[PDB]
Structures are given as C-alpha cells and as structure tokens.
Design a protein around this ligand. Structure first.
Ligand SMILES: Cc1cc(C)n2nc(CCNc3ccc4ccccc4n3)nc2n1
Ligand SMILES: [Mg+2]
Ligand SMILES: [Zn+2]
Length: 324
C-alpha cells in the first residue's frame, strides 16, 4: 500500500550534481527552491551530504528512500513534495548555523523527518477528518495526520532496500526513529502553542537546559514549527505566491464542506478572499512572529528567519492599508 520508485528515478538521482552557483545560495535562510523542481531531490541529497558527510548513508539506499518519499506526496496545491523539500531546506540552514548543538543522530533524523513530515497529505485539515468523520480520525484521535505521516515514514523505511538506518545499532536505530516521531508530531500546529509557552518561560527563568532530553525535545519541536512555516520567511514575491497555494487547499476543503450544507470558517471560504490580507496579518502576529522570536532567543544564529518574517508582515500591513 506504499509506493516505490523505479530503478530509473533513483539511478538518475545518484548521477545528479549541484550547479556551482546554487552552492552559495542554498546556505541562505531565504533561499527559494521554487525555480528548480528537477533538482529538488538532488538538492536534498546535497544537503544531507553537507550536513552529515558523504558516507553517512549508502548512496543507493538513500536515493531510493528520497524517490519513494517523493512518490508518496500527493498532487495537492500546498502540502506536497515542494513543501516537503522547503521545510527540509530550512532545517538544513538551522542545523548548519548551529552545528555543534546537535548530534549526528539528530541531524540525520531531523532532515529525514522534515522530508517525511507531511507524507500522503490529502489536503484536509485534522479538524475535517475528525469533525466529519474519516477513517483516520477513528484511528488516531489527536494529531491525526501527523501520526499517519510518521507511520508512512516507517512503512517506507521497512521496504526492501530502503532502510537507510540499517547500519545503526538497534539502540541508535530505536533512537532516531523516536527523534523522527517526536519531530513529525511536533508539526501539529495545535501542539505548538503549549510548546512555545513552556520554552518562553524556561528561557525567561534561565532554566532551559539542552542536556535535559525533555528540553531538547521541546527545542526540536519549535525548530520543526519554524521550518514548517518557513514560507513566511522567503522574499515577498515568493511568500505572496505560496499564500495562494495554501489558500487553494483551504478553499477546496471549504468547497467540500459547502457541498454538505455546512458553512466553512472564513479561512476556508473562497467567497471570503478579501479577508485574506487581514488573516495573514493575524497569523503572523499570533503564530509566526512568536515562533521566530522564541526560536531566535534559544538559537540566536536563526535570527534571519525572524528578520524576513518581520518584512513579510510589513508587506501585509501595506496590502491592507491599500498600497500593494
Ligand atoms: C504558509 C502558511 C502556513 C500555514 C499553516 N498557514 N496558516 C495560515 C492561516 C491563515 N489564517 C487565516 C485566519 C483567518 C482567515 C480568515 C479569512 C481569510 C483568511 C484567513 N486566514 N496561513 C498560513 N500560511
Ligand atoms: Mg503536517
Ligand atoms: Zn507541513
């Protein structure tokens, strides 16, 4: 019930090299993968090799994993392969700019987890699957999609020739999987608020301690959210464009509601388009700014994320006031 890549797909991958000019641009937090679809899987291998070294995974098994993950992202407007790699890229930048804070094991786990974090997304919110009344909400009743995504990741690992973690001890194997699980569950935005609040406090009292595993988990979680949302840290044109993609998905789920005489919340209602700038302002102020603010406090090198989010914010203020 999992989808595998073909020999063609994965071998083509092994042969790919990254054009010299992108090398510098990839290191930047605002880098946009948009213009480079062909390369996306190659871009991930590259980021892997630069994070954890060229012989951290067997190249054959790695390329097979990457290409089978691709094949399990659906052709929805926003929760797709492209989102998969963007989040992956942002975590690379974060890992690279904080290199000694994390273990080899965390850097492998987190890059993989980002790639896999929305696997087999159908373009439906957790609310929609539960609130009416899909087979997966009968199976997991909190964080529905995210438990599914992790379970997909594990199913891809368990496929013939795909287990990129096979050469770890079973202690190390069972540790990274646990890193990956927490990482993917942390992408459930509903968990983020409680998590960000804890962290905020712990930082404030000066009681945050990266040697304490439960603290560690919390920081990673925040990192996960900050990567999940990084669309808002691109340059305006890109950000604007991506907003269209996320709204296209919302509105389609709103269209499905309307089809059962149920009015969707305004966020999901394409007849409520002109409230979008306002809604974006809201989101930046209630969700994104606080995310990047706290992330910067804990990991100062991540400041450029906060800096760009601030710029997009002021772009949205400008759309509202009638000047874009
Ligand atoms: C890149 C990215 C990733 C995520 C998860 N979100 N979630 C949002 C919520 C928008 N909020 C709202 C809230 C209320 C609204 C009301 C009307 C129109 C739009 C509205 N919009 N915007 C995102 N952008
Ligand atoms: Mg998700
Ligand atoms: Zn996501």
């Amino acid at each position: 019930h999992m989808s595998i890549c073909t020999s063609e797909e994965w071998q083509g991958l092994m042969q790919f090299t990254l054009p010299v000019r992108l090398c510098k641009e990839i290191e930047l937090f605002h880098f946009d993968i948009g213009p480079f679809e062909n390369m996306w899987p190659g871009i991930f291998v590259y980021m892997v090799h630069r994070s954890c070294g060229t012989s951290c995974f067997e190249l054959e098994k790695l390329c097979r994993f990457i290409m089978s993950v691709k094949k399990n992202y659906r052709r929805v407007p926003y929760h797709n392969w492209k989102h998969a790699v963007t989040v992956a890229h942002c975590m690379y930048a974060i890992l690279q700019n904080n290199h000694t804070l994390f273990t080899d094991l965390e850097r492998k786990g987190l890059l993989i987890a980002c790639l896999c974090h929305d696997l087999d997304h159908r373009g439906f919110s957790n609310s929609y699957l539960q609130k009416f009344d899909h087979p997966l909400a009968a199976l997991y009743s909190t964080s529905t999609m995210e438990q599914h995504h992790f379970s997909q990741t594990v199913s891809i690992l368990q496929l013939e020739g795909h287990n990129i973690f096979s050469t770890l001890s079973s202690s190390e194997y069972e540790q990274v999987l646990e890193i990956i699980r927490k990482a993917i569950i942390a992408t459930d935005l509903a968990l983020y608020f409680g998590n960000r609040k804890q962290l905020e406090e712990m930082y404030q009292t000066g009681s945050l301690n990266l040697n304490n595993q439960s603290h560690r988990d919390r920081v990673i979680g925040l990192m996960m959210t900050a990567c999940d949302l990084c669309s808002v840290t691109k340059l305006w044109p890109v950000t604007k464009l991506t907003a269209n993609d996320i709204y296209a998905e919302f509105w389609a789920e709103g269209d499905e509601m309307k089809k059962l005489g149920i009015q969707p919340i305004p966020m999901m209602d394409r007849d409520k388009k002109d409230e979008v700038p306002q809604g974006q302002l809201g989101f930046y102020n209630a969700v994104a700014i606080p995310c990047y603010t706290t992330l910067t406090q804990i990991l100062p090198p991540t400041e450029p994320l906060l800096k760009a989010c601030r710029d997009n914010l002021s772009q949205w203020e400008k759309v509202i006031r009638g000047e874009e």
